[PDB]
């Protein structure tokens, strides 16, 4: 059964390897601004490498990890923000197109 993304995030953060890789992904594939969803082009390579760095962890893509936001309770908005960082990430989409 597909787990809740926040639960999966917690299982990742307790492992020093996954915690580090996840943090790198959020850092390198973040928007260039609150208004601009894309990152600066100069960061494409680092964003893709960071995204690929998730492979081998519970955050392995297949794209978003294997999780959804069912049963998020009061934390639904946060769960969706997490999930959308994978599914609706302009920086990541552009990086994959550029070097994937």
Swiss-Prot record:
Residues of the full protein shown: 239 to 346 of 468
Quaternary structure (record): Interacts with GDNF ligand and RET: forms a 2:2:2 ternary complex composed of GDNF ligand, GFRA1 and RET receptor. Interacts with SORL1, either alone or in complex with GDNF. Interaction between SORL1 and GFRA1 leads to GFRA1 internalization, but not degradation.
Tissues and organs where the protein is expressed, per its UniProt entry: Expressed in liver, brain, kidney and cochlea.
Name recorded for this polypeptide: GDNF family receptor alpha-1
Subcellular location: Cell membrane; Golgi apparatus, trans-Golgi network; Endosome; Endosome, Multivesicular body
Provenance organism: Rattus norvegicus (Rat)
Protein task: Coreceptor for GDNF, a neurotrophic factor that enhances survival and morphological differentiation of dopaminergic neurons and increases their high-affinity dopamine uptake. GDNF-binding leads to autophosphorylation and activation of the RET receptor.
Homology family: Belongs to the GDNFR family.
Spans of repeat Sequence: 1-96
Highest taxon of source: Eukaryota
Disulphide bonds in the chain: 5-67, 12-18, 29-47, 39-91, 69-79
């Amino acid at each position: 059964e597909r787990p809740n993304c926040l639960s999966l995030q917690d299982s990742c953060k307790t492992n020093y390897i996954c915690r580090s890789r996840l943090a790198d992904f959020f850092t390198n594939c973040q928007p260039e601004s609150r208004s601009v969803s894309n990152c600066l082009k100069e960061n494409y390579a680092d964003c893709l490498l960071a995204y690929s760095g998730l492979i081998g962890t519970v955050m392995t893509p297949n794209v978003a990890p294997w999780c959804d936001c069912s049963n998020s309770g009061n934390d639904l908005e946060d769960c969706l923000k997490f999930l959308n960082f994978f599914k609706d990430n302009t920086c990541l989409k552009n990086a994959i197109q550029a070097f994937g």
